[PDB]
Amino acid sequence: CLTDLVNLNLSDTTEKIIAEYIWIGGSGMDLRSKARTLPGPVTDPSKLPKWNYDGSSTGQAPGEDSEVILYPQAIFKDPFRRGNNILVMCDCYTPAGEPIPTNKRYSAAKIFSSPEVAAEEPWYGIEQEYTLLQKDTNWPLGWPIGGFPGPQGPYYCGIGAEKSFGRDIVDAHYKACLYAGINISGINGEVMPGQWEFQVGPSVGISSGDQVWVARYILERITEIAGVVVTFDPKPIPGDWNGAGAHTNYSTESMRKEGGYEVIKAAIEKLKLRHKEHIAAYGEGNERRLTGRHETADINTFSWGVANRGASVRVGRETEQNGKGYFEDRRPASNMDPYVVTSMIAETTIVWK
């Protein structure tokens, strides 16, 4: 029946290829996509045709002047259609070639191109935490309707049918991402029951944002299959339950080299000064997350420390002991735009003085 058809191997019958064009909609947080047939395999982004879509259905264009343009930027293998089919992360433009206001890749790309940034070759490890919900009731997976599971404690990295909710989805996503070519560094179950995490492992400059977005796309397509809902809301349940962040781990060339630790403290120092303006771009609703409790620092203070999960920024024991490595910006919410967060960190850290 139905999976026989979804899983048909096309290679036996044509050279033709399906490409799923993915872009970001009007809200800056909604992923959209559609698919087209291409005459054969393609491995290079610039050999893919540009395309358009109805921007008036995605809050990005008026009905009378409706076309918005898609620029292929990155190709991944499609873990759903498989074979030689592909996913294509895109970028949005007016027909005149202007980037639309919700296109944040463009600015970010500029910054990562700028030669004093490219020289420093910045690395990002982003930790995407999210929460699984039951469809329709919108109540976290594995929670009884109108009630609560036992208090936090056993759920973090836990095992067992009463502790761990949705591993199916997580493991499927892990492999799907690896198969697609995403640099996914690992996964864990989080503190709040029904909450999980994956890491997009050290990725350079613009490709970090590209990868996180596609990772997100893949996640949500998987939950879709499973009949479950995902939120990237930073604090889906009020009270004594963890919120969801997108910790950004960061290092430059000079930070991972001998006596890098000194560059790190300097970079932290710059971040301290631009705290306010980073907060404003670090995802909406973050006030409900960053309270100083539940392994967050208060939104209003800035702090840093060594193995300190209460601080705005944390430096690993490992990198302290080696006088070189990376640090962790814990401030960004799970609904953060990685293009924005990632480039803004480069800018505050290299360019600005």
Ligand X SMILES: Nc1ncnc2c1ncn2[C@@H]1O[C@H](COP(=O)(O)OP(=O)(O)O)[C@@H](O)[C@H]1O
Query: Contact positions toward ligand X, by CB under 6 A?
Result: 123-125, 127, 185-186, 199-202, 247, 249-251, 256, 325-326, 328
Name the residue type at position 9.
N
Find the shortest distance in angstroms from Cβ 1 to ligand X: 27
Name the residue nearer to Mn ion (CB basis): 127 or 220. 127
Picked from ligand X, ligand P3S, Mn ion, none, the partner binding residue 320 (CB below 5 to 8 A depending on kind) is none
Bridge partner list, 20: 35, 87
Beta-strand pair 184-189/195-204: antiparallel
Picked from ligand P3S, ligand X, its own copies, none, the partner binding residue 118 (CB below 5 to 8 A depending on kind) is none
Residue nearest to ligand X (CB): 125
Find the shortest distance in angstroms from Cβ 339 to ligand P3S: 20
Find the shortest distance in angstroms from Cβ 168 to ligand X: 21
Of 247, 174, 250, the closest CA to residue 205 belongs to 250
Angular region, 239: left φ>0, alpha ψ -120 to 50, beta rest: left
Name the residue nearer to ligand X (CB basis): 34 or 276. 34
61-90: buried (b, 16+ CB within 10 Å) or exposed (e) per residue?
beeeeeebbbbbbbbbbbbbbebbbbbbbb
Find the shortest distance in angstroms from Cβ 89 to ligand X: 19
Beta-strand pair 31-38/228-231: unpaired
Find the shortest distance in angstroms from Cβ 75 to ligand X: 20
Name the residue nearer to its own copies (CB basis): 223 or 343. 223
Structure tokens at 18: 């399906």
Find the shortest distance in angstroms from Cβ 347 to its own copies: 29
Q: Please report, as ranges, the residues that interact with ligand P3S according to CB under 6 A.
A: 54, 57, 127, 129, 190-191, 197, 242-245, 247, 289, 295-296, 309, 330
Name the residue nearer to ligand X (CB basis): 190 or 233. 190
CA gap 341, 353 in Å, rounded: 19
Bridge partner list, 140: 133
CA angle 341, 323, 246 (to 5 degrees): 20
Residue 207, exposed/middle/buried by CB under 10 A (0-12, 13-18, 19+)? middle
Residue nearest to ligand P3S (CB): 245
Name the residue nearer to Mn ion (CB basis): 221 or 314. 314
- The contacts of residue 169 (CB under 8 Å, 6+ apart) are 132, 196, 219, 222, 223, 226, 228
Q: Please report, as ranges, the residues that interact with Mn ion according to CB under 5 A.
A: 127, 197, 247
Name the residue nearer to ligand X (CB basis): 276 or 317. 317
CA gap 150, 136 in Å, rounded: 23
Find the shortest distance in angstroms from Cβ 313 to Mn ion: 11
- Please report where in the chains the tokens 């960004």 appear, as a residue: 332
Name the residue nearer to ligand P3S (CB basis): 57 or 94. 57
